[PDB]
């Protein structure tokens, strides 16, 4: 049959399971794979973020190479809101207030003068010997100090080991964060991984008792099938089949492969979106739904431009 | 600068037209292929990417009962806007039911 819009708006429901910071798990009853996969593939490659693109070095005296340091700085998540910023029009080396952000990783390593007796520990001998990302100084340009407060534009994780130094060695570079989508380069993706899975169903076609129920209790994942006592015997009943890894272990045992019908429930996807921290995870799912609408609106504008009629 | 090419089959035949959508992949090309196929006035709707070195898709739409094949394609797009808008409205109003149960539970 055809697309009854009021059959969709009656049977669709989203059931959020867990949402702390930098994680999200929700269900979607009644959406089909060709839309849910579009949400998944817009999270991984279409939702834009900010990340480092140019690196302007002076005195990389370190052991980490000049090329590998720039590639290593590219993969560091910047905690800037992407929606505030624009794409760079091609060919500008110095972007404006709106295009680019800046940083400066300026670390010099030196020996620790005092409390350096009979020890070989690096924390007691050296100062600034592990270049973390909390050594990055945001350098606002134009009027960017007014748009964002003190402490908004920032690296996300502030523990990422960039380099590792010894005395005499210096890193004095300057960065340029840009805007991009997650398929131009993988350093722009907002998500650790975004995926889904159908909710499995398990249907005991035969009542199993005794030790065969304990043999059934260990074929599935811990928490799927529960063994309960009903007057001296131990009968098994399923309980939350969401926990199942769908590993097909019951189809190895011979007498018990013909009592359960391990299949999947159609159109009952269980997403999970884990952000890298640039945006909160329930704002990344919103700006992934809102990108597919923009892809529709651009082609509707092109159809309005082709046929005036 | 353009983003959509309509290619008629035999010039006079506006029932079969292969929409060549620029800057695309299987994200919108497979969601549209699900929506245009939900039309009973469409005999056949399939898409293919041209070559993965390119980033445009083909999208064949061909109809029965004498409809020009841009009307299942406008209905193909607006009935996906109306689906993403409803998914957005049931998502943003189910996050809030979760936040306001995390707040008012033991805090």
């Amino acid at each position: 049959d055809a697309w009854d819009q009021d059959r969709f708006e009656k049977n669709f429901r989203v059931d959020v399971v867990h949402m702390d910071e930098n994680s999200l798990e929700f269900d979607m009853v009644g959406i089909d794979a060709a839309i849910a996969n579009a949400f998944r593939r817009i999270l991984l490659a279409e939702v834009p973020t900010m990340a480092v693109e140019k690196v302007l070095v002076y005195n990389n005296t370190s052991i980490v190479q000049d090329e590998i340091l720039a590639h290593r700085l590219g993969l560091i998540p910047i905690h800037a809101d992407p929606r505030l910023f624009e794409y760079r029009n091609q060919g500008d080396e110095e972007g404006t207030e709106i295009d680019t952000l800046q940083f400066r990783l300026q670390v010099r390593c030196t020996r620790n003068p005092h409390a350096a007796k009979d020890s070989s520990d690096p924390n007691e001998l050296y100062v600034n010997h592990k270049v973390y990302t909390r050594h990055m100084t945001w350098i606002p340009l134009g009027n960017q100090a007014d748009l964002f407060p003190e402490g908004t534009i920032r690296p996300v994780h502030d523990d990422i080991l960039i380099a590792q130094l010894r005395p005499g060695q210096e890193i004095d570079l300057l960065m340029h964060c840009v805007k991009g989508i997650g398929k131009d380069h993988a350093k722009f993706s907002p998500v650790a991984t975004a995926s889904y899975r159908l909710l499995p169903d398990i249907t005991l076609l035969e009542p199993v008792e005794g030790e065969a129920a304990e043999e059934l209790s260990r074929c599935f994942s811990p928490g799927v099938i529960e063994v309960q006592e009903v007057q001296g015997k131990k009968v098994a009943r399923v309980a939350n089949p969401r926990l199942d890894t769908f590993s097909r272990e019951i189809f190895r045992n011979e007498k018990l492969k013909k009592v359960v019908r391990l299949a999947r429930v159609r159109d009952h996807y269980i997403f999970s979106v884990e952000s890298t921290g640039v945006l909160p995870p329930d704002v990344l799912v919103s700006e992934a739904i809102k990108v597919l609408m923009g892809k529709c609106r651009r082609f509707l504008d092109e159809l309005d431009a082709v046929q005036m009629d | 600068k353009t983003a959509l090419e309509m290619v008629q089959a035999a010039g006079t035949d506006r029932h079969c037209v292969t929409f060549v959508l620029h800057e695309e992949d299987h994200t919108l090309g497979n969601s549209l292929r699900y929506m245009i196929m939900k039309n009973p006035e469409v005999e056949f709707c399939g898409y293919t990417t041209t070559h993965p070195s390119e980033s445009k898709i083909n999208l064949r739409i061909q109809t029965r009962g004498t409809l020009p094949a841009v009307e299942p394609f406008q209905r193909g797009l607006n009935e996906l806007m109306n689906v993403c808008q409803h998914v957005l409205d049931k998502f943003e109003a189910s996050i809030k039911d979760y936040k306001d149960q995390k707040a008012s539970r033991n805090e």
Binding site: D15, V16, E25, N240, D244 | -
Partner: peptide, 8 residues
Amino acid sequence: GNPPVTGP
């Protein structure tokens, strides 16, 4: 595979 808190 925690159970949902927004029930049906």
